[PDB]
Amino acid sequence: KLIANQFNSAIGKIQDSLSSTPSALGKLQDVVNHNAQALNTLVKQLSS
């Protein structure tokens, strides 16, 4: 019973940890930012 209670408490705390403002999902955002930045610089190189 107490093991299940601890597990449920940890699972619930996971939700507030994720939903809180300081997102730790910078890894996935980094890839998208790199791809976008490469695309923009490739576009801007045309005007040279």
């Binding site: 576009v43 801007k44 045309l46 005007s47």
Partner: protein
Amino acid sequence: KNKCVNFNFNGLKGTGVLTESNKKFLPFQQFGRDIADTTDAVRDPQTL
């Protein structure tokens, strides 16, 4: 209008589909542009 046509507005020769623009052109402003250094809008060298 509304056709992929060869336009030659005051020498600015090019091909594209011409459509009405809602751009808030100021009276002095003549040529439009975009992020990627592309003239997306033009002012008539005839009746405005």
